Amino acid sequence: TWTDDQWNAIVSTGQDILVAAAAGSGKTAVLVERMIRKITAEENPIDVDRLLVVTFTNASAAEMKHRIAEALEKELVQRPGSLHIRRQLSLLNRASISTLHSFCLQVLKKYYYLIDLDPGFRIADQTEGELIGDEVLDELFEDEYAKGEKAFFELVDRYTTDRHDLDLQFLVKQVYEYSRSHPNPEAWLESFVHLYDVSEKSAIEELPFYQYVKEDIAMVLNGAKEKLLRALELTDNFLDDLAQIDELIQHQDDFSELYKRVPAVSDPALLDEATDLRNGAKKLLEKLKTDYFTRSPEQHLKSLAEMKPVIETLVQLVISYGKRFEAAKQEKSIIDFSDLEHYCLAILTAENDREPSEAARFYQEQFHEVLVDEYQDTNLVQESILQLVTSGPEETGNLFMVGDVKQSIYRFRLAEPLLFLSKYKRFTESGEGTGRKIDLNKNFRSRADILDSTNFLFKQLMGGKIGEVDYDEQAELKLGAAYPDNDETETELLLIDLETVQFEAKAIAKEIRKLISSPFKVYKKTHRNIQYRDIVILLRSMPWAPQIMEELRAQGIPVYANLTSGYFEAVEVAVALSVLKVIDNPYQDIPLASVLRSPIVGADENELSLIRLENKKAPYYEAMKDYLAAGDRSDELYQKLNTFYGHLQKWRAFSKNHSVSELIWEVYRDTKYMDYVGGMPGGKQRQANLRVLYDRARQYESTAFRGLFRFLRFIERMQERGDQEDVVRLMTIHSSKGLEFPVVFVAGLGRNFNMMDLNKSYLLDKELGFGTKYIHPQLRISYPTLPLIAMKKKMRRELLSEELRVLYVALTRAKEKLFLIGSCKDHQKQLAKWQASASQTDWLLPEFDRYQARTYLDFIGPALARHRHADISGHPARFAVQMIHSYDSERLEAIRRGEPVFAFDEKAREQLSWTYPHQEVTQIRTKQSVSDEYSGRYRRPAFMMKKGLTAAEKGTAMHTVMQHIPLSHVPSIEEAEQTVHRLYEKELLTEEQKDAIDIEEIVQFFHTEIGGQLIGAKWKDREIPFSLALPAKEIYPDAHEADEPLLVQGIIDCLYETEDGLYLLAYKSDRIEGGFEGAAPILKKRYETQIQLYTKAVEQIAKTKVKGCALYFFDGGHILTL
Amino acid sequence: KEVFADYEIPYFIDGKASMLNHPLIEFIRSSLDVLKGNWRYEAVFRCVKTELLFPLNEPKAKVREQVDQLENYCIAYGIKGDRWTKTDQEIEMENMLNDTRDWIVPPLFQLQKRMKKAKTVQEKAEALYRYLEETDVPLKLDQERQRAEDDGRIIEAQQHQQAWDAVIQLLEEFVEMMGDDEISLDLFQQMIEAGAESLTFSLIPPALDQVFVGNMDLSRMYGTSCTFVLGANDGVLPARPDENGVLSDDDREWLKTIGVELSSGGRERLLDEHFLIYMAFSSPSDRLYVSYPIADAEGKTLLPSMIVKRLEELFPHHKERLLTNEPEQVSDEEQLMYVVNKSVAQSFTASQLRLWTREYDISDVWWSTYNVLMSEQDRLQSKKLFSSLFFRNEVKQLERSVSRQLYGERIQGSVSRMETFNACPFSHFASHGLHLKERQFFKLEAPDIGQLFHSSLKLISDRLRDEKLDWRDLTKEQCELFSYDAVERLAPKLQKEILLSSNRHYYVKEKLQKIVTRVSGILSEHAKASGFVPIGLELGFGGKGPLPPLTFQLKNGCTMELVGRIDRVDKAESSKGLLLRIVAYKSSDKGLDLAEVYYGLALQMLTYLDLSITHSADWLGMRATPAGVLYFHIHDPMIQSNLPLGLDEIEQEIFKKFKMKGLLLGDQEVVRLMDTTLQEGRSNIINAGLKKDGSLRSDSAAVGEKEFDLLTKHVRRTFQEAGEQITDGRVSIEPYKMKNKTPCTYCAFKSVCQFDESLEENEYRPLKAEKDKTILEWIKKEA
DNA sequence: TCTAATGCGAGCACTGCAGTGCTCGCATTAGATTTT
């Protein structure tokens, strides 16, 4: 069965539809069914290729195809005579179901000729692409420096830390990369200046950015008052303060007014707690003052208008970068992932003087409906592409989108959830003359205590400017699980107070072992004890990942976490590269030493220093050689070196003829480093690391780069800048996604969010554009500009929204049990901070206090306190709080040298001593020609070479003639020429070959005895191809064991038959006269072997016998018999 | 190829091999690159390293090394473009460098003469050809052909002069079609480039007994017993309709209806895929294996194709095996299939013993395998391999016979050399013991910048005195002039004239200038206030110089003559007698942390101070008491204030930020001698203040003369205890973490020390952040 | 780089030379720390 909401999503039609699918909505199943119907229905079915389905991964798309396939089979078994249904089953491979990028690719491939794009274009990975950006940038900056334009230097002096210019070039990238999130980058770039065009005559309450200044003041002022009022309830001077505040609240609108007021005017438990509340006012007001009111509205304006010249320079720079970048790609026929979307949009839009091009029209025609998953993460470029392949205005049309704003956690990649949210508020629950929207509340996959705990917290947290979304019914999760009633399913909070992570990791570790030793049986299925793989620890970031893993594996099950970097500081990688470095250039003291001391060689410290002694001044490399040369053979350290120096020179030569990836593998199998690395702790991850280096070398050969040197720098770049077992899985909340677990630990909840983004001298924003500090290089003075401050306030409450959703996916990824684990300093006090916040009724916490939040605790804590004022504390959510004070053999030693002392003792012995019986024939060529790529046996350019022929080419020419000469009778010098000319006409002879033929030497043969005999005969044939199977030995004596037959193939020049028997004939252009009496013996032995094979072939295959064989020689016209 | 090479399985591949990795193809490409990108040294050595330019008859061994050394050179000196075309130790070197380029430049150079001059194709294709012959490519090729054979590789030897024809036929066809057509390198090279990519090697002829590895389309087979099918992945096996060619699937399908038949290509192929997988599945007589990988080359997920599903429909009860390199995941049976070869047996056993010590119960097949390998001849190696089982990165203490002859008779100490030791004993061994040197580049590093400032400042003095002038007599006009000229004299002679190399650097020039100009003005303002007058400047301390080195005698025949520099020493007369303080110019902010001093990380200032004090008596005939140690911050500031400021107040804020940080003396007068402008409140020149009563503030960085003479002694004992450990031959590895920071930051020797925390026995020695007093009393307790 | 965040020293108000809290101001000092 379905819910009415699912049923709606499945059957609705006639307009755009937005499906808000909560966690575990079963959206996939519903998405499948909807397509299944339109494709398999009695009324009037449609083919699959008429649908467009975009997903966020090729795996989920592939997943889509499988589930579509099954249902088709099922639908088929019932209608076994369905021609349409069977056909659809064949269309799934031709259907468009993929990531939007995957679609864009198909578009570019098809309509490439409309834009400027080389078919067979290549997609560069985000790495080489950036490395190209660095290059074009350096060229750009160099050109500007040389051009010496005034404006340029003003921009540089201003934004780069003098003493180096590095800082300017990532601002350029940062800006560029941002612009690409816009359907029209350039325009959006030129949009920057419009903000900085202002006068002292301008109204600040008007312009765009002040919106966030307005709302900021509103909060703080109100937050002040609301923070004071309680001090009054605590029960004088708070009325002076208060009255003054009210006076400010009256003028919240007038900014110029605030500049006049704000700057100028401004029990021992509850007694000393009421004083800090009054300080809250001070602190909040002081900040309010410093931010906006330390300078006049007029001076703020002047400060702004002054930076306009700079902003223009900056923009024109980024634009020049964009052009150069694109041009650089074109040269190498490549594109980025941004290009993929933008070129597609370019194809889809053909504007003259904005039009949905005829390419667009095709896709609008082709797709009857378009389905987009994870829509909350869509950007502007994608959306404009979507709106373009979708046919019809919003009221009607075939756009069908599904997702959940509450689960939008990717804004740092510039995804726009407001796009989804704007449509949700624009759409009605019905379909009347607008986009139809549907909600999926039921969570079929999670237990009640989960949904209740999650619904409980985010009801007091998500909302207004922090949540960006009102948390209400039709939004709240609803129970659809059939879970049996059981306890210890309660959500737990473990509060604890470098070692921070240690005390944090153990608390986690503990309850885990509680779970394992204790029953706790996970779940018409049946209960299951904890397999360690059903439990997971989710972190926001991965600085603690390594530390956690350690002690969690210190006792019991090990830990698996998907590590990203720290890869270049990995010992193996270091050593491996070190080896490649020495192979490239042996003259590097550090890289060489790093190898010699590594397990690969294993030199001692005394051995290393011993080496240097030989030569102190010279580089270490030859200090090693100098040790070798004069060294004594019986020396151990000498061995180690000599062996290594042997490999080095082998590797040196090897890379010369081979690729980098190949050399790497060779080094791995020569040193057995990868094998060795598998024998030390964590050797599994180490081996992986060692073989991704090989993979990256593979990815590197397909790039615009080549050679070992470039590869090294390539890796050097990555360094400098970017970089079925049952175990506890440690992973980021961001990587959690559609994944799901019985038990979920979310730790680090007591750690600050990353606000580092809002600090620097500049900020990039979608709406507002570019913002920066006022900076004067001559006066050496700088300070935040008004827009800058405005962009921060906005960005902070948007960044905070993101975190509340990140925390929302964390809790929803659980099916049965939850662990919330935070950390702080002083227990009680924070709970008092929380008490202060948790007073206000209405559920949803104070919009300002949520704002002040820094750490996840600041969200949970206060929302948790009020729980355990009617429904809030009676809410069917359960919790368990823990206040933690934070403080509370022979075989190896045999292996160390020799062997120990089995069931397989006998088999292991023979398999290692085994041999391939037919081995010695495995390297021998099957076919072997005698004169097709399947057989075996200093040229100068024709334009620089002579005019004539070579002895070989002449011979071939002479040969051809003899084989085409009519054997009817004895030809004359003339009749021979006629043949030579006929060949020439028919093109069996090149103009040269013709002129190179000596007719006499050809006619001569037919005057010899053999000639006359050839003429007069019962039967004759020439150019006779043959293949003769022989025992391998018969040719190759060397190998003696295997007697498998090989094919010897050749052509018998001539065979003729007389009343005597069968005779053989061969013409040879060998040079003789320069008598022939002495040449005969030599010639005889030259073709001695060949001729026997000929007769062999005839005698064995034809089962007749060859009596005598003649050879003719054009030089002198001789003959000899064998 | 790799896998089967290891597993010793002979095979035959349908496809052919690209020639893009062949020396001849490279040499050609890189050559054109050399004269297009205008002699980027990367390209030059790209050609030289195909060693087709190598001198004739001269032993390769040397040649390589000479080439490498030349490479290093070109890298550190940024040699490019025209630079190419333009007594004991340096002769050997510099001449080798002139010999090497002497056989490199001419051939590659003469070519560019030819190329650029030639207009049409044929003459360009020809100029290229000569470049090959005049360098004797054929000869050297043939030579290399031999070495391949003598090493057992004939196949490789065959591809050599087989590569020779490929390039020629390319030229021939080129000059055939467009030979007499005009054109220049831009397009000419592009076509050569596309020619190389297309170049192929002759298909490797089949052998009597081989495994047949080929495609699933046009490959043919006969009498096949067992057939394995690879990549049954979805999107792969029933290959998604390929989007290629000039005509779209739509176009072709349309043409059909007009009575025109073309190649299928689009959707028909997808119909034909089933026939092709049908022939594949029915190919073998005995067995059929259909496999698919779960993960990706990079780790992405991969699903099976619809074929596997249907196979499961025709054989619902058929189980499907698992292919893994983790034998413990399978039964003893399968685990016995890994012992196919010595090498692979080893590689697997090593990993099994590992996972075994981890408390996991392994299979006895590997114990058997172990004992077998342990009974052979190459036992030795396997033994090595298995030593990995217990590998703790171990540093064997040096011995006496080595440390002595290595480190030398006298250990000529440096304050920096001592800091590097106590930072991490191993780093010392690598730097001063093994004398390891990083590769030099043409980048201007942060430190060398400092060396500029010094010499600039030192230079400014000389001219001041020469005009009988002093910093305080200076004007804002003069500060600028004087400073600029200083960098003029210097810039060209700094770091391989990198400042003159590119445009970005000549901007970095006046950048460094404007800094000095400011610092010059600040010093003036500091001289008009300070009552301290400089005595010695850049005082030569140790070795050959104004002062005797300070010596260290300790048990075990130890000798430590440590040398050093003294940036500035200043004198001021008070009622308490002579006063001496030391100033050192610095790039960063903070100067002295007592916590760092305890562990001997910062001994610079305190050690300098002693000498000045101690030697004061003899030196200038008077006993001095320490005024303190100061750090001057060299930089051009950016103040940030919310308060609007006038030029008046701006100069104040700029001035305040050069406020010196360090360690002072805690009496009223010493402060006032350092800042004579100060009456009450805080000082902008130095970190100290004065209450109304005349006493200074608790915020002052000042301490009693006792504490000063306390630290000084501590620095001594450090040089002693750390001075002997060296002679003892201690090279151990012990990085510190304090406070939350480490010495491994930019440390170059990290790859040599190979420090691994996870691996036990390798630890970070912790140091604790300490209130200046908390390490103060610690010192007090020592003696 | 860069917000909080304590210190330390007096100036002032609050009440009885004089004391006590309170407050401000100026600086250095921690203490921090991304996602794919």
Ligand code: SF4
């Ligand atoms: S990185 Fe660490 S272990 Fe390595 S040399 Fe430096 S201080 Fe020593």
